[PDB]
Enzyme design. Structure first.
Site, PDB file in Angstrom:
ATOM      1  N   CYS A  32       0.869  -1.159   0.000  1.00  0.00           N
ATOM      2  CA  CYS A  32       0.000   0.000   0.000  1.00  0.00           C
ATOM      3  C   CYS A  32       0.949   1.266   0.000  1.00  0.00           C
ATOM      4  O   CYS A  32       1.481   1.578   0.986  1.00  0.00           O
ATOM      5  CB  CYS A  32      -0.887  -0.096   1.273  1.00  0.00           C
ATOM      6  SG  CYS A  32      -1.808   1.399   1.585  1.00  0.00           S
ATOM      7  N   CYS A  35      -0.012   4.070   2.299  1.00  0.00           N
ATOM      8  CA  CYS A  35       0.304   3.650   3.648  1.00  0.00           C
ATOM      9  C   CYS A  35       1.777   3.999   3.998  1.00  0.00           C
ATOM     10  O   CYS A  35       2.100   4.538   5.055  1.00  0.00           O
ATOM     11  CB  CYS A  35       0.097   2.115   3.786  1.00  0.00           C
ATOM     12  SG  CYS A  35      -1.613   1.507   3.672  1.00  0.00           S
TER      13      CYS A  35
END
Length: 105
Positions: A32, A35
């Site tokens: 991600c 993220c």
């Protein structure tokens, strides 16, 4: 300082040792990008708000915790006070993350 969580027992123990403090939990995954882009800002909040407890849970490390928490979109931020969930949202939105903290602390 951001707590790194690596079991369900450590997660529960952290929520217990929090006392009355807001606990903010970042559920993320290595695949991600956003993220990984928000991680430094997450660390900054933990340095800024020494009154609030910050944990990170990697969903592929802690699949049980991830499953039990009903995480769907990466990243997800959950918020707890006295073991109870008092907030949640997904997405790497810095402004919203901080605003949420200031509403709950």
């Amino acid at each position: 300082m951001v707590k790194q969580i690596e079991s369900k027992t450590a997660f529960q123990e952290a929520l217990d040792a929090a006392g009355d403090k807001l606990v903010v939990v970042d559920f993320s995954a290595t695949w991600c990008g956003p993220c990984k882009m928000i991680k430094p800002f997450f660390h900054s909040l933990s340095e800024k708000y020494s009154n609030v407890i910050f944990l990170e849970v990697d969903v592929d490390d802690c699949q049980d915790v991830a499953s039990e928490s009903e995480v769907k979109s990466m990243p997800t931020f959950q918020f707890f006070k006295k073991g109870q969930k008092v907030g949640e949202f997904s997405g790497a939105n810095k402004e919203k993350l901080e605003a949420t903290i200031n509403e709950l602390v």
